Design a binder for this molecule. Sequence first.
Ligand SMILES: *[C@@H]1O[C@H](CO)[C@@H](O[C@@H]2O[C@H](CO)[C@@H](O[C@@H]3O[C@H](CO)[C@@H](O)[C@H](O[C@H]4O[C@H](CO)[C@@H](O)[C@H](O)[C@@H]4O)[C@@H]3O)[C@H](O)[C@H]2NC(C)=O)[C@H](O)[C@H]1NC(C)=O
Ligand SMILES: *[C@@H]1O[C@H](CO)[C@@H](O[C@@H]2O[C@H](CO)[C@@H](O[C@@H]3O[C@H](CO[C@H]4O[C@H](CO)[C@@H](O)[C@H](O)[C@@H]4O)[C@@H](O)[C@H](O)[C@@H]3O)[C@H](O)[C@H]2NC(C)=O)[C@H](O)[C@H]1NC(C)=O
Ligand SMILES: NC(=O)[C@H](Cc1ccccc1)NC(=O)[C@H](Cc1cc(-c2ccccc2O)no1)CP(=O)(O)[C@@H](N)CCc1ccccc1
Ligand SMILES: *[C@@H]1O[C@H](CO)[C@@H](O[C@@H]2O[C@H](CO)[C@@H](O[C@@H]3O[C@H](CO)[C@@H](O)[C@H](O)[C@@H]3O)[C@H](O)[C@H]2NC(C)=O)[C@H](O)[C@H]1NC(C)=O
Ligand SMILES: *[C@@H]1O[C@H](CO)[C@@H](O[C@@H]2O[C@H](CO)[C@@H](O)[C@H](O)[C@H]2NC(C)=O)[C@H](O)[C@H]1NC(C)=O
Ligand SMILES: *[C@@H]1O[C@H](CO)[C@@H](O)[C@H](O)[C@H]1NC(C)=O
Ligand SMILES: *[C@@H]1O[C@H](CO)[C@@H](O)[C@H](O)[C@H]1NC(C)=O
Ligand SMILES: *[C@@H]1O[C@H](CO)[C@@H](O)[C@H](O)[C@H]1NC(C)=O
Ligand SMILES: *[C@@H]1O[C@H](CO)[C@@H](O)[C@H](O)[C@H]1NC(C)=O
Ligand SMILES: [Zn+2]
Length: 911
Amino acid sequence: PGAFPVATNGERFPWQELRLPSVVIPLHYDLFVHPNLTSLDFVASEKIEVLVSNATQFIILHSKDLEITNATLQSEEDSRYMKPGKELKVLSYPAHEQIALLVPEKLTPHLKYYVAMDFQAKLGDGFEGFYKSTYRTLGGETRILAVTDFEPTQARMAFPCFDEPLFKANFSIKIRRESRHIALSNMPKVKTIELEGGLLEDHFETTVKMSTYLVAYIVCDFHSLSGFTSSGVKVSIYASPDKRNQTHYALQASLKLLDFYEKYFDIYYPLSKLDLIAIPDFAPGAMENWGLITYRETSLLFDPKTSSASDKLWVTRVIAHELAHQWFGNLVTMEWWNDIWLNEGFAKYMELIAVNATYPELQFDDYFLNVCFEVITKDSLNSSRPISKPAETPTQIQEMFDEVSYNKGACILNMLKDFLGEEKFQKGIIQYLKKFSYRNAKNDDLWSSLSNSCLESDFTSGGVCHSDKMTSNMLAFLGENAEVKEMMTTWTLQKGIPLLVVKQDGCLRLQQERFLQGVFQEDPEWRALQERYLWHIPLTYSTSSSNVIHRHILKSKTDTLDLPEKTSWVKFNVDSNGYYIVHYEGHGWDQLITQLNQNHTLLRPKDRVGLIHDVFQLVGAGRLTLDKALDMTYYLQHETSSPALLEGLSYLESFYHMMDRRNISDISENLKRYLLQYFKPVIDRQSWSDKGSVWDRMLRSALLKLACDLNHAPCIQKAAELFSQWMESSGKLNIPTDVLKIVYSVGAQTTAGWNYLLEQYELSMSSAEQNKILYALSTSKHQEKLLKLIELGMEGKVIKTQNLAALLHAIARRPKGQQLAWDFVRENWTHLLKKFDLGSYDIRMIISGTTAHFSSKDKLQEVKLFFESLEAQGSHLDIFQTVLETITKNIKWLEKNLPTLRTWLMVNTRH
Ligand SMILES: *[C@@H]1O[C@H](CO)[C@@H](O[C@@H]2O[C@H](CO)[C@@H](O[C@@H]3O[C@H](CO)[C@@H](O)[C@H](O[C@H]4O[C@H](CO)[C@@H](O)[C@H](O)[C@@H]4O)[C@@H]3O)[C@H](O)[C@H]2NC(C)=O)[C@H](O)[C@H]1NC(C)=O
Ligand SMILES: *[C@@H]1O[C@H](CO)[C@@H](O[C@@H]2O[C@H](CO)[C@@H](O[C@@H]3O[C@H](CO[C@H]4O[C@H](CO)[C@@H](O)[C@H](O)[C@@H]4O)[C@@H](O)[C@H](O)[C@@H]3O)[C@H](O)[C@H]2NC(C)=O)[C@H](O)[C@H]1NC(C)=O
Ligand SMILES: NC(=O)[C@H](Cc1ccccc1)NC(=O)[C@H](Cc1cc(-c2ccccc2O)no1)CP(=O)(O)[C@@H](N)CCc1ccccc1
Ligand SMILES: *[C@@H]1O[C@H](CO)[C@@H](O[C@@H]2O[C@H](CO)[C@@H](O[C@@H]3O[C@H](CO)[C@@H](O)[C@H](O)[C@@H]3O)[C@H](O)[C@H]2NC(C)=O)[C@H](O)[C@H]1NC(C)=O
Ligand SMILES: *[C@@H]1O[C@H](CO)[C@@H](O[C@@H]2O[C@H](CO)[C@@H](O)[C@H](O)[C@H]2NC(C)=O)[C@H](O)[C@H]1NC(C)=O
Ligand SMILES: *[C@@H]1O[C@H](CO)[C@@H](O)[C@H](O)[C@H]1NC(C)=O
Ligand SMILES: *[C@@H]1O[C@H](CO)[C@@H](O)[C@H](O)[C@H]1NC(C)=O
Ligand SMILES: *[C@@H]1O[C@H](CO)[C@@H](O)[C@H](O)[C@H]1NC(C)=O
Ligand SMILES: *[C@@H]1O[C@H](CO)[C@@H](O)[C@H](O)[C@H]1NC(C)=O
Ligand SMILES: [Zn+2]
């Protein structure tokens, strides 16, 4: 009783382990919450119907920053705790966010009890728990609401509970309100009862089985727009009253999307209603609470005068994502946070297939490869992780919501689908979701259901699946099933991403390596980090002679294939559907670049964006010289697939901003010239309108921002005119949404426009328009102004605090601000902790937002120092090492190819 931890009051806490005990299993929660929005208080009470599997003396729960007032225990099966039951003694042990209740006599197996507590707290001033949010009306009034955000482990800041995702229970929620407000929660309201003083009591329908983190309840002012799905779900979009205009497309798109998901999964959405509500103060982008999905206004609200088409594509993708959570994450929750990718990676993947299903016009298929490329940069560093990986503390759990669980999870799924086909892939996910509905799954569970997918409706006679035959196919289906489950599991447990090397003989030797950046092949530690890595990569390839795609699994470090027609070139990873990079040896890279400059149309357009990415990443690998990747961008002047064109330019624009930050004004002036002159035709075709289709529109904003970011004399002139008209018309005129952001940042370049822009930020009713405005403000060249912006965001009264993170990142992007942001962060690191969690995305982004672009040996030392200073104070985050590898990789890239870039650009001048 000594090595045991000590509760406050000084006692021995019965448990001392980070997890909870699987002996008292919660079945049903009766939750009564009564918040006061004038006091900014809440009073609440709860009765948990629990089951005991094993005899115990002590009950262990989660509670945090909650004052428990009263603790009792009753039963209708165990006589001893007969009505009105017995009082419990409460021991709190905050270090593990656990609360221990002791009973006067041990309890009985297979007998259900009722645990009751009365507790109270203040509404949070953060972005978690049961917190306080605030919005501005059109009149200029300020109103309050109370809102919940619990994922992953802040449910316990609102009510005591078994805050782990496997402890699934039903929830019955009563909420007390003034007549001024309404109350929402996960399920439909069945009753509202008049109370003595004048207050009302909302009783909500008791929920289905679900994890704690999804519970939701809201008290507020809002207005709604309703519609019904083909399955008869009442969908409603909620926002502050003056913003109900902007709420119309969210309703149209969510109806179409809930329809798509029900038919695709062959599973009806189980609740009667579904609510989407735009929360003014919202840290995450959105959250998927079952039947009560919360968003930032930017995620959900669309206004047609001030939102761009790209804005529309973003709003429609979050709705897509959140709605995919109702099955992946709510209908089937992962067993533990270690397999969080089971929720997020699958949800992210269904954004693709559903947005492509219901809004092809938005041309989202063409931008999905960007999801893969974004994680590939981090999976090329040794600081990455395998998809599934242990996590125990609340900060580690938060860390798990990254590019790995989300993007990598989705790219390995999309790779696996190409392998099996939509028909086999769909039927596999329907079997998964039906089988695990209302309970949890672990990583291994999924691969079994996807591996044993049945291609069609189970052909009873004589089938390959169920009800009955024994054939040679049957030994191959059973045999290919365990081929796929073996394959996927190594992608799941191996950090990193493979590099397929292809040497074309007379008739193809294949080698497999762990792709790595920074580190070169000759380097001392390159052979040390290639240890033990091997993937079952499902390859693809097509050749110069025929469009036929050949598919060849590879399960060894070396292999070789025989080419029949011995054609001009071979291209592996067709449409880049596979999570790997191909490097060609000896006039095979040269062969493909030859094609791109003659008929680039003899390679399908995903192959072209695939090569463009692979080419530059191999320059990062050192396996290629920069002259070759720049030699490929030559063809881009004939390029017609807008995705390949913008992928290409993006790299070139990358370089310019890199040079500009380091003051290298020879190269970032020829870079300026090479873009403006070589791509002058495509730039000058663009409107200053909203006139085209979605890739026309999306391509117009892209190029015009490019030209105005390079101070192209004409485009800066047209933008400043448009800004003046808008300012001199007191907003009576309108600016096309595609150039809205460009115009604002042009205007921001004088104090007059900047000050007007800030003053008209406070009065806008479109949070898209604000988001664009704040960017424009962040492009000021006066450090006097940037500092104001950052201080306004620290304050949080004008520029809301859910923007201080992305603001800092914006300021840091541009040269005049990359320091001031760095200085600020190190000078107020402790203040920034009192506003955000150490594992929050707001901190991970504040950190790399201001450091990860550094590319000099001298800056790295500062950062390593600052990070050490932090780890010294007990703060550790994986993001630390990731930045350092990134900063390091930047230094090596400059050291190895800066002369080549400089020389390549001068050479182009001559022709
Ligand atoms: C959160 O707390 C706020 C206060 O911080 C609270 O608002 C207050 O509610 C009380 C209770 O309803 C109000 O006090 C009453 O006001 C009415 C007039 O509106 C008076 O008539 C009351 O006195 C009589 O009431 C009875 C009849 O109903 C009589 O039988 C009795 O004998 C009295 O003669 C009493 O003064 C108070 O006005 C508000 N505060 C305001 C409006 O500023 C709010 O209700 C709480 N919210 C929740 C959800 O709990
Ligand atoms: C906790 O959540 C659980 C879900 O995870 C709930 O379990 C569900 O409970 C319901 C009710 O017992 C079961 O519903 C079944 O539905 C059929 C069809 O109902 C028929 O009768 C009605 C009445 O007129 C009619 O309207 C219908 O159309 C049908 O004609 C019933 O016949 C069954 O007996 C059964 O009631 C679900 O199957 C069940 N699902 C699961 C996964 O367990 C549980 O109820 C929740 N607990 C609490 C206390 O609410
Ligand atoms: N801007 C972002 O990418 C933020 C970054 C972030 C912030 C906080 C946590 C995790 C990630 N993503 C979200 O807020 C997420 C994921 C996501 C991606 C997209 C997206 C939509 C359209 C187009 C591109 C997109 O990427 N929309 O949402 C909503 P979730 O459904 O998984 C929910 N259960 C998250 C729960 C959570 C809350 C607090 C801590 C930890 C986890
Ligand atoms: C780069 O290669 C492509 C091949 O994919 C070239 O386009 C193709 O050119 C041939 C030759 O004209 C077309 O063949 C067909 O000939 C008959 C004979 O009259 C005619 O009736 C057909 O309609 C067609 O012209 C082939 O179809 C054509 N493909 C397409 C999609 O038009 C391309 O022209 C080459 N590069 C350049 C710069 O031309
Ligand atoms: C995106 O949507 C399109 C919808 O047409 C898909 O393309 C079709 O896919 C079906 C299979 O469901 C094929 O039989 C058709 O021939 C395709 N038509 C066209 C015009 O391409 C496309 O596959 C979808 N992409 C994803 C990833 O789901
Ligand atoms: C507790 O559960 C375990 C599970 O292994 C079981 O063996 C045991 O009999 C149960 N009861 C007690 C008192 O441990
Ligand atoms: C326990 O709850 C009852 C009911 O509200 C209350 O009267 C009592 O004060 C509470 N706690 C005690 C007496 O310790
Ligand atoms: C809200 O909707 C109606 C729809 O016709 C429109 O006439 C009204 O002006 C709108 N108000 C705002 C502020 O957009
Ligand atoms: C790479 O990561 C491994 C695994 O965490 C670690 O053992 C090693 O120190 C790291 N090395 C480098 C050079 O990053
Ligand atoms: Zn998600």
